[PDB]
A paper describes a structure:
One such assembly is the Ctf19c/CCAN, which anchors the kinetochore on chromosomal DNA. There are 13 Ctf19c subunits, and these associate with a second complex containing Mif2/CENP-C and the Cse4/CENP-A nucleosome. We present here the structure of the Ctf19c determined by cryo-EM. The structure provides an overview of the inner kinetochore and the coordination of its various functions by showing how Ctf19c components are organized relative to each other, how this organization positions defined Cse4/CENP-A recognition elements, and how the Ctf19c supports regulated recruitment of outer kinetochore proteins that tether the chromosome to the microtubule tip.
We assembled the Ctf19c from individual parts (Ame1-Okp1, Ctf19-Mcm21, Nkp1-Nkp2, Chl4-Iml3, Ctf3-Mcm16-Mcm22, and Cnn1-Wip1) and purified the recombinant complex to homogeneity by size exclusion chromatography. We used these images to determine the structure of the Ctf19c to an overall resolution of ~4.2 Å. A twofold symmetry axis in the calculated density map related equivalent sides, which were separated by a central cavity. A refined map corresponding to a single Ctf19c protomer showed amino acid side chain density for much of the complex, guiding modeling of individual polypeptide chains and their interactions. For the Ctf3c and for parts of COMA that are not well-resolved, we fit the density with poly-alanine chains and numbered the residues according to their approximate positions. The structure shows that, rather than a network of binary interactions, the Ctf19c/CCAN is a defined complex in which subunits interdigitate. C-terminal parts of Okp1 Ame1, Nkp1 and Nkp2 form a parallel, four-chain, helical coil. Our density map showed that yeast Chl4 shares these structural features and also enabled modeling of the Chl4 linker domain, which connects the two previously-described functional modules and provides extensive contacts between Chl4 and Ctf19-Mcm21. The map also showed density corresponding to the β3-β4 loop, which extends into the Ctf19c central cavity and contacts the Ame1-Okp1 coiled-coil. The Ctf3 trimer (Ctf3, Mcm16, and Mcm22) and the Cnn1-Wip1 dimer form a complex that recruits the microtubule-binding Ndc80 complex to the kinetochore through a flexible N-terminal extension of Cnn1. In addition to contact with Mcm21-Ctf19, which is described above, Ctf3 contacts Iml3 through a network of bulky residues in both proteins that fixes the position of the Ctf3c relative to Iml3.
Residue numbers in the entry:
A (entry chain B): -1 to 242
B (entry chain E): 16 to 42, 50 to 80, 84 to 167, 191 to 336, 374 to 454
C (entry chain G): 4 to 36, 40 to 121, 135 to 177, 187 to 204
D (entry chain D): 125 to 173, 177 to 201, 210 to 272, 279 to 284, 297 to 317, 333 to 364
E (entry chain F): 162 to 224, 233 to 295, 323 to 386
F (entry chain H): 43 to 66, 82 to 88, 104 to 120, 129 to 232, 297 to 397, 411 to 459
G (entry chain C): 153 to 187, 193 to 328, 337 to 359
H (entry chain I): 124 to 150, 170 to 277, 289 to 321
Amino acid sequence: NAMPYTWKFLGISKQLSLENGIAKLNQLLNLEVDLDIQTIRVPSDPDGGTAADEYIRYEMRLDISNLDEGTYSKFIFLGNSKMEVPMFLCYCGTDNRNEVVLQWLKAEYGVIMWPIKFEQKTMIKLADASIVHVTKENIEQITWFSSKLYFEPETQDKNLRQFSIEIPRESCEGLALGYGNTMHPYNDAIVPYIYNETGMAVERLPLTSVILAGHTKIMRESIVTSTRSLRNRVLAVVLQSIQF
Amino acid sequence: DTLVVFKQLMKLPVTVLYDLTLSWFAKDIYLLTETLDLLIEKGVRRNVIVNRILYVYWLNVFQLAEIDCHLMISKPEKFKWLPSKALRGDGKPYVVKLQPAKFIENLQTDLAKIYHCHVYMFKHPSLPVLITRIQLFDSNNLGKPLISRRPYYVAFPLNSPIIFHSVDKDIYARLVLQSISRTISERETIIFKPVQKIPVKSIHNIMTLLGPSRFAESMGPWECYASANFERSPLHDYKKHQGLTGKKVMVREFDDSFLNDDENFYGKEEPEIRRLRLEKNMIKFKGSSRYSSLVPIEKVGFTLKNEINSRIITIKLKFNGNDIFGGLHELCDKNLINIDKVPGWLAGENGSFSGTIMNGDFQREQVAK
Amino acid sequence: TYNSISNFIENELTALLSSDDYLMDDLAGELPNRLLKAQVIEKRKDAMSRGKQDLLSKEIYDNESELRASQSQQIMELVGDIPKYSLGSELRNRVEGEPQSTSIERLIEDVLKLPNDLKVLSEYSNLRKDLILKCQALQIGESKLSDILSQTNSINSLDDDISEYFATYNGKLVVA
Amino acid sequence: VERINGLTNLQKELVTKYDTLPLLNMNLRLSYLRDHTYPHLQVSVQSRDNDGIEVLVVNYKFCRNTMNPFEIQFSTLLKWEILRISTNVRLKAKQLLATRNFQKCLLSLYEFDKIKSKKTGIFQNLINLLKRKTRCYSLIVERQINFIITMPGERGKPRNCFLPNQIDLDEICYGLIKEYGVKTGLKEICNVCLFP
Amino acid sequence: ILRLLETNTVSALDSVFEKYEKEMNQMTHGDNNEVKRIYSKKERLLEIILTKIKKKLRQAKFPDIEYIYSKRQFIQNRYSQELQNNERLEAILSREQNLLEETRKLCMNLKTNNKKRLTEKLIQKDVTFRNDSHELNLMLNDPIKSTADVRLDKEEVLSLLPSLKEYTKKSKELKETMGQMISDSHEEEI
Amino acid sequence: PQLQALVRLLCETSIIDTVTKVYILLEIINHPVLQSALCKWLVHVYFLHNISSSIWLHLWQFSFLQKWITPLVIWQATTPVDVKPWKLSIIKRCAMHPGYRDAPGSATLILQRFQCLVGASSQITESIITINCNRKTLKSHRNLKLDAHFLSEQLAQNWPQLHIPNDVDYMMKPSLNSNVLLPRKVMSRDSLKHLYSSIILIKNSRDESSSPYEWCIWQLKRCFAHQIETPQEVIPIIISVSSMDNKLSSRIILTLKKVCGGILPLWKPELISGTREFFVKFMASIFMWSTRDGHDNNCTFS
Amino acid sequence: STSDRSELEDYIVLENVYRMFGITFFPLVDPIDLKGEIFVDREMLGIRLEVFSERTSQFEKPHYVLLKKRIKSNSWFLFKHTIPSFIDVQGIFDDTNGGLVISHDDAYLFAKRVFLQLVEVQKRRQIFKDLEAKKIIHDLDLDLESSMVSFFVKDIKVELFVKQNEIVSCSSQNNKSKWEIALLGSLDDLELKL
Amino acid sequence: QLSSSITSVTTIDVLSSLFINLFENDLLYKLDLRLFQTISDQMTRDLKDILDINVSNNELCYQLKQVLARKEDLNQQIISVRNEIQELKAGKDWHDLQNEQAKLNDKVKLNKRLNDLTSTLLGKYEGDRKIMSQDILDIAHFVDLMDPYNGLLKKINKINENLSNELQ
Amino acid sequence: NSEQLLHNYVSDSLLTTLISFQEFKQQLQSYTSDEQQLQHWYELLQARDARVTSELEARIKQFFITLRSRLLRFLESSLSLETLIDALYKINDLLQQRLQILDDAIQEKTSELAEFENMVRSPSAGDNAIPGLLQIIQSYINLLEEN
């Protein structure tokens, strides 16, 4: 909680492609906003089985005079038709334009909406999805930071309230290399590590909010970051989360 | 002043303690006994006893006449502490001490700050004496009385290594500590109290936690050594059933860890196995609304320097809360943390020392303020 | 500048009169309204005023003397760099009489006496030596008790070598 | 996932030890007992219903010594006798057992056996030197380093001051017994016998 | 201007009392004067002109002395006692800084003792007793740590000890007479 | 003519926003105002088929709830409120996923709400008409097996589910016999079928049973009073009589209400069985009558 | 059964005599033991600590001192225990053999040192709180380890400070010289003074 | 402000000066003369004194406050001094004095006694040729106590053991 | 108190006398007007605001006089040989007390060892012990020699 980009999430009933009525949104709010459309076949390192990677993140690129997150208010809409829930909506910032954007999104397509109070396995999965940094070679190296997995289990009588687990970056790489090699360091090493140490099934735990260092504050439902963008494999797994 | 003393004197019960206070406060006195007899049977108008004695028999010598408020709000617990050892340049301690030799530091601070008082006390379940110790310091305004600023407390138990002074961390706090360092020296012995763990709670659950008790380290999973709740004496046939005792088959298998970490399913077990889960929890954190701790530990921070593959592995682990380890059996009863792999140092045996364990070598981290 | 700042104070005090009649600013028309007799009277005044600086030279030394006297009362009331301790209570009050600690502190006062504090309380030292001699008599009393208890055992309690040697050699030669 | 009780056989409970208590009997109690208190002990029970009881304290370093008690209650406060002594000590034991308190008594008798043992264990490897060494009753026969074994009536546990151109030798030996160990103090006294 | 008229009345009365002092001074510096009825009538005329000026001042009301002495003396005395306290604490830090440099000098003297034990071991260059003394149990003896010699104890030996040692010599001769009998029991097993 | 026709309905109402919202949604299928938007839901059902309104519910709302949804209760309440008083298309389409997620990881609390939706849905048994005995018998069997499987609270929830779905399906068959065109034949079919399934349930619930007593009582009354008020089921006299060996099991049991139900079944049987044949069915019926009369001459104490 | 129930009762009476021996050891293992083959990589001696009274001639609440195998090298350094901290464990522990304690006999004499260190505390409380507390009417009170002890003789308040059963302090030249004495002289001098 | 009473003093000075001109025009009047000029100048310097005394106290108030801060420096300072004088008896308890009496007596006192003893018996290096006697109550006690009980019973049962050898 | 003395000095005994020095110029020098110089004294030395100049003089001179008292503090930082002899006498006395205590307890140990054991061992006889010893010894030696 020292980073600005707040990214509340939202799911979509059925996919409708967007470039048809971008004139309609630009009509209603009178402000030219780019819609970018681009295929990405994440898992871009192909260890996912190559199953329906048609991922076309639609980028309502609210590119006006950059004075706020109410001025830069980029959206990302990732879609896959061959998955049951097809599509979700992210949105950054705190603009009031987004309200009529989503209102129109309900309206003109006839789709129904719900937020995502996602869960523990979710938080861990996208947690270590956050640290694979995208390379131009697309063989993607592994960054590291320092976890601070704040919980807040209520018990009876507020007796425990809140108890941290913090890991230096050194120990992140330690349990990485001692595993050894992966692209899933958390579920492969770290939560197996601390299960073997403190016997804390952090999967089963009432987690509330993993912080990773200087880089995100994943919360109960609302990933917050320090980048004007979200990594695409992160977006992939958050699409993967809601599915069945 | 009168508002402050009314906030104090409303916290009191009445019964005859007010009678004895006002008795020695009045040190007329023949028939004052028959004033107070009637006011014992008219011990009814409870709050306005305060101002009526405070006006009939009413900050220079008055200090002991108010400090019995501290003497009797020692009844409750509300305030806090922190402990401090008493070394000698070798790690040998002592605090073997005759009581009335406190005129010594009275005179010694009187050499350095102005005229002054401090009643001693004696708690009466738990055997320290404690020193309510009001620093009369100043008198300025930019009217002839002096300021009684901040009653700093020093309680020390009988024959410990430990004293626990109160928590202020000031240039008068450390001054009175600096005095009471030297006035307990008495032999050109060297005292120089260093500090331990920073947070705290109240008196009984600081001395049973540490000091001159028998739990010096006896707590956690070990209170059956604290109490002597088995292996009674030379008796004969109690020990036969004590050599014919129960147990779960809480198997230490790795396949059992597969059964516990993985393999989540329904109830599927009778109340015996449910009971045995519950006393696995109980024996892990106590050793027998019941589900509190013994002692309120309030916040701790553990550490964990494993070394693995000749390479250090360091997780820090801070807690917070309002009482932890009781919280942890009340968490672990929900089968949330997988009890057999709960090591002792966060099972809670150390009594609130945020130590930095490493390969089973729990410590303290001296860590002066 | 003890009385020198006050000397310049009184000098600047009279220098108003000096600069006034020296300029003769009002004295030019004051003959109309002391030719130089006015300034003669002025240094008469200032020679009179030097009694105040005589009082300065008095009272400054009075003040410094009484503060030196207060310093003397301080060193007489405190220990004159004497940290000596349990005798340092003993000369003012009895506490308990620890013969262990009084003995050991007595083994540290005898360091470099000739080779302060009221001739180091030779009377209290004599009182401690008298008390130790009293304890020495108290120990010698039990020593006499032991002597008289052991002496009543010595008086009550208080050839054949070769004979038994020949008998044992004969036992060897008659049994072996 | 069974739930049986446990009186013996390590393996079972050594699996199912989720507590922390004294372990349990099987012998690993009594093996630790006997094997980590070296001279032995025997009994017979003789119950009543308040319990007269015997014991056979096998004092056991090289030459035996024993003892036997009297009754208790099942609250363990009753009275006790000695009914068999070995004659290696006759009346020093009665100096001890003049008073009661078997803890101190037994310990001394125990540590006293270890004292006799270490007394001999020093004497043999000082006799090992093959110079003019001669033999004495309890000290040495060269040039008279004796030492008592007091088994006193002051502190309850037997202490042993020493004896070794007389007072001079006393302060010198008290000096040298603070640097190089008791097992080498004979080697030091050898050094002031060997060259000068 | 009620406060103005009040302060004017008080100040004029103080000037009237000082005028009485000045009238006594002029009478002492006078030729021959002892009546002062003209002085009392002049005080009356001054009060009359003072009331007339008070009328003129209340008319032109165009809008504190012993109070001044009191508050000034109040803060002077507070400042002086504050200064007394200052030199008291200055006395105590002077005493203890004297002590600090004393013990600092003595710890430097301990460092000279370190160099001296190097030199004193250089003149003649040539632990487990705790474990053994509690392995067995032994005793120690220390009538030492006194700079004066203790073999001249025969001053205060006089209490009972020479009688003691003579009777022990008597018991020594008695045990010699008892230990005559050992002549059978020298080498019965050697 | 629905432009001006719905505008005439606006002349009869006060709710232009929902009119134009029909002409262009989730506000409506969330909720003068409430009854007016309810009529808008009706009008959307009119102007649609059932798609653009119903698809909301009959996919996404229960298929949140099979995973999770926050309040979880008012949504399902409005879900049943929509689909129950409405089309058999919504009913059967919902019931497809109902039986499937039943056989799949059933959530066992949402399936109560889907059971209520079925309980009004004589639409469901109506619109199927082909092999409902297949589908509903399979669903009942799957619930019985999985109730015993998550049984072996476990047993109380086995009782709760396998009895409560039974009672709801029995109410559904009661509605089917209220229609009874071919639902009479299917009513005989599923009636005897679920009677047998609950009978084997009572074979797993002999001396330990709580709710299933009321279930079998419901089944018996749904036979008996239906046959009494409708004596047209003479071809279904086999079905009306068919409680024989199960009735031995039923009189084989406190079962005061069970006996009361058996008394009712037998009394209406003896009434409307005087017109029956005195050889095969009514011989067994009167045989049971004699056995129960002997049980009555034993009940004169016992 | 009762086949070897007599054998068990024989063993526990053997245990009972072995624990009036005082210091004993007894195995235990805390559940840190990986691998029905089962490693144990940390082992506990565990030293129960038992004192015999005289005033009741009972045994007390025993103390307990339980150390454990250090991970690295075959040592025995301390772990949780309970004797009240007016007695040190740690310094008097690691005093013995430089803290480098490996065998069991050095461990034994460790607990021996602890034991008698405990027991004369028990002895002098057993002097004061019993003998002249009850023979003499005395109105006594005292510290946890008997070191500021104050009372009526019968009449008046006398404090005295104690050390290794030898009186040091006292609370008159008569008074002071009669009481800077040894403990066995204390009861005798209160017999004599009256 | 005080300008009002200043103006009143000016008016009183003017009128008193007119009366002074009348008195000195005819001359007695010395007393009245000094009376009203004392009135005038006393009023002036008293109003002047009270106003600048207000100024002086209003500033030395806060110079006093500055010396109160000086007292605060005193208290922090004596904390630090007493602190360091306290743990300077910790480093004097430390290794310095400990190694002092751990090597001083070691290689001075005991080696003194040892070299004195070697000067004695090396100076008479013929000890194995001269004396060997290092030139008692303990031998007195254990011999005189082992004789009358242990020697007696040991001898009589050893002779009875010889009787057991003789008969059996 | 010292500051009180010093401002009392500087205020009273200096400035009141300076005001007296002002007013005595009207009285006895002549009979002239004798006030012109008084207002010129006013106008000129109204740079001595005498309260403020007095307090500045105080807050200089009192302070360096206290510095001078700090300087003149240093004074210390025959017939004592009799007490030195008394101290050496008590040194011998208490060293003797320690040595006599050790010898007293050792002799008491000899007493408790000897007297109690030799008395209550043979039931308090002290008869001619070695005579009976040698008699039975010679008899047993004759019996063994015959054996």
